[PDB]
Write a protein that binds this ligand. Structure first.
Ligand SMILES: *CC(=O)c1ccc(Br)cc1
Ligand SMILES: [Ca+2]
Length: 124
């Protein structure tokens, strides 16, 4: 669920999703169009595409299971579809953590729709 995605961002990237990734660039926020503007924005774009490929369950609402083990987040449970959602959230949390060197809200927060042209939308 989205609450769990916020939780994974806090655990992995040591940052809040709502404070740092909810309106950054073209894609770190709900939906999106245009080009991923930088490495953090591309992490959100891939997360959108991953969610778009989940068939059978709901990435917003459904609750997945995970454990911390061997220094990593391990997605689990008995449901393949819910584990797919967890994998999308875990990959994006690690992607955020790994691209903190580049993060730049001064340049990219509330980047604006003109800057994210419908015609430049990179396909998944
Ligand atoms: C999938 C993803 O990264 C993302 C980020 C922020 C919001 Br709000 C929704 C989705
Ligand atoms: Ca988005």
């Amino acid at each position: 669920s989205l609450i769990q995605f916020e939780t994974l961002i806090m655990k992995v990237a040591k940052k809040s999703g709502m404070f740092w990734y909810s309106n950054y660039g073209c894609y770190c926020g709900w939906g999106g169009q245009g080009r991923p503007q930088d490495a953090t924005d591309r992490c959100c774009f891939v997360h959108d595409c991953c969610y778009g490929k989940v068939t059978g369950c709901d990435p917003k609402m459904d609750v997945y299971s995970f454990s911390e083990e061997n220094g990593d987040i391990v997605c689990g449970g008995d449901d393949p579809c819910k584990k797919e959602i967890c994998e999308c959230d875990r990959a994006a949390a690690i992607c955020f953590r790994d691209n903190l060197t580049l993060y730049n809200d001064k340049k990219y927060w509330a980047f604006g729709a003109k800057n994210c042209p419908q015609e430049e939308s990179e396909p998944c």
